[PDB]
Symmetry: C3
């Protein structure tokens, strides 16, 4: 199924008929960071499997729902579940849910995910406001927009220089200062590693030379589809480890260590993003 | 359809039957830079759609013709239209037209395209003679030659150290000096960005660290197929903008700005390449 | 055919029924470096084409056999033939033979291949013990593990920090010292170039900036599949040329030059790996 105007319209029509919510804000919350979705008010839960043209996710399994409702008086739509390119999903499968958000009326997309630290000053448990990116799949002919252009959504050649909205970054930092956790919040450049192997010790060292602050396997595909169709983005990384220090000390990482960092910061991140939603223009 | 000896021969046989021209020189002219094709003498226009085994381009649409005739007393063949890998064309689709040129007798291929400037001394409207390249798709398992080797055309493992002919670069500069526009002409290393997003601000900064002078979304696939089968190449970039300066100043780019640079230089580039064709060995 | 538990079990069952050997050690020997396989004792030769679910290799042609027997009193299994990703084989095709080795009981995998030198101190004919890697296909969304995870074999997100076993590297160097050829043996970081074009002059210069010591078109896919399923690895490069010196001197390379280096070192490498097999834990 192509992520075109007709197919995206069929999905939006179904959703409107079931929901009655017209959202202005979309959220994609990474694994371990989804507690806010369980607190959406007056909510409506729509399994992907019932939405016309949504991608098939039964090989990977696990949860897959669209959730609509209110947070802080604002109308929102959340993607509950993982759609990452290391799983083998195509460009068209990643793009269709974001283009459905557009047709439902979304103007701002908020994204969080766990990631590895490269900048030597980043500690486990820190937050990074993403201000730019280095897209290794995109340089290497695996950009999420490779294929025919869908002209109804955006231009053939998009400019990404303002993909990460500056005022949303400033609002997120202001709320951190108000609640006295600004010492946990950094800004930086995100490297997209297609994955699913963690960055190797020698890949990490290369990334430090190249001016990368954080590295991860998510986020950039959704950022590019959003930017192509005029949706503003705020993207935040939660740092699981410092991969440069781990390379110098010969220290390993596992899945239990990463998800324990999510558990440590889940409630603060939930509070932070509730206030952001409440306050954004 | 595979870009093999049988399929390429069927296309060449059709072309010979219609044309009566045996060309020695091939040209691929980028968007906005094609006026020379409209001035080919005693010309014959063959739509791709009528040539056995030529790739299907109706999803992207727009023009798609092979044009044969004379320029400066030389016999040439031109590809009129865009075949770029960010559109989703396969390795086999890109390669077949170049291998047809080979079988028709082409010995020299000339290529022009718009591109982004990285070297700090490059200005909008400058020309760069390409002397080498950094192929990010090729390092990342999307080289145009991934697949079975077609042994009739070339070796399994090609050497690219002389892919950009030195004497053709010298002849192009000599003609610029004769016509007193040598101040617009530079040489440099081309980075292939698969695209279709322009290079991001932070990708541009990385490319400067890595010794790249220019970055673009074209040219390298055709260069590699030509080199594999023994065709000499001259490739020239027309600089649309300096992406390093634009990153430091927070300045954006759009499609209208890029094509306006093509309009500014189209007539000079046409004159330049007519003389090159006339004079090359 | 997917490289899953069921399909790999069907292949292992066939092999056990024919062979009677339960191997502890696997070997993959690169082109020109396979003489040791012709000296396996009490050996049994199984063409890939007769093994359920093994990949089809008839387009590339040439040899394709699994060989089981004894070396130095140890029970081994060898892959005789080339399975490289520049040929167009899929992730699933590369992975299935390694996962069959796992099910047959292999605990250690030894790998050799020809490669290009980047570090300025590397000479034609030198050996490099690989201690880490930079996986350009993996950063660019062509990692060998992209796709659904096969949970019976390993985790969704593998850690590669100990992919190249330290004690096996130490044992290989110790044997070199015993036989007084330690002056030929270096250690270093391997860059994976998907290929099949050799690294260009300007790509080589980039790789030197990025801390790469050697560059090649093999090895890393097998390393990653082995690490995912708990197999220890020793990987050795035979240096064909120094690509940095060749770029500074404008010197080319061809297939006959590369294979002549293999001929020069084949007998010493055979002796070296026989002793390693005899002595490893
Ligand atoms: O995305 C995840 O859920 C995830 C969970 C556990 C492990 C890995 C990932 C993929 S990630 O963006 C990430 C997390 C940690 C380090 C590097 C990259
Ligand atoms: O190729 C084109 O026709 C083109 C036209 C308008 C915009 C972009 C392109 C693709 S390019 O090689 C290029 C042009 C400008 C900057 C970077 C890359
Ligand atoms: O792998 C081979 O058999 C091979 C044989 C002749 C040429 C090239 C290769 C692929 S390689 O890992 C390699 C060899 C030499 C330089 C760079 C890379």
């Amino acid at each position: 199924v192509v992520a075109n105007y007709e197919n995206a319209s069929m999905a939006a029509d179904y959703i409107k008929r079931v929901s009655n919510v017209l959202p202005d804000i979309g959220i994609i919350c990474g694994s371990g960071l989804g507690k806010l979705i369980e607190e959406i008010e007056e909510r409506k839960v729509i399994p992907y499997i019932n939405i016309p043209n949504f991608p098939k996710t039964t090989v990977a399994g696990h949860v897959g729902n669209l959730v609509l409702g209110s947070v802080g008086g604002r109308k929102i739509v959340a993607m509950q579940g993982r759609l990452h390119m290391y799983e083998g999903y195509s460009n068209q499968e990643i793009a269709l849910p974001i283009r459905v958000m557009k047709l439902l009326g979304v103007r701002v997309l908020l994204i969080t995910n766990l990631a590895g630290g490269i900048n030597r000053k980043l500690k486990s448990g820190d937050f990074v406001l993403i201000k730019g990116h280095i897209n290794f799949p995109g340089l290497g002919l695996n950009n999420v927009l490779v294929g025919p252009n869908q002209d109804e959504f955006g231009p053939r050649f998009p400019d990404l220089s303002n993909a990460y909205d500056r005022l949303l970054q400033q609002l997120a930092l202001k709320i951190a200062q108000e609640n006295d956790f600004q010492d946990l919040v950094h800004e930086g450049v995100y490297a997209f590693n297609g994955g699913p192997t963690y960055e190797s010790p020698d890949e990490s060292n290369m990334l430090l030379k190249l001016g990368c602050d954080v590295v991860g396997m998510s986020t950039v595909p959704e950022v590019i589809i959003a930017c192509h169709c005029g949706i503003k983005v705020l993207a935040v990384s939660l740092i699981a480890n410092n991969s440069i220090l781990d390379a110098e000390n010969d220290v390993s990482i596992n899945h239990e260590k990463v998800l324990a960092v999510a558990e440590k910061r889940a409630d603060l991140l939930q509070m932070w993003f509730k206030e952001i939603i409440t306050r954004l223009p």
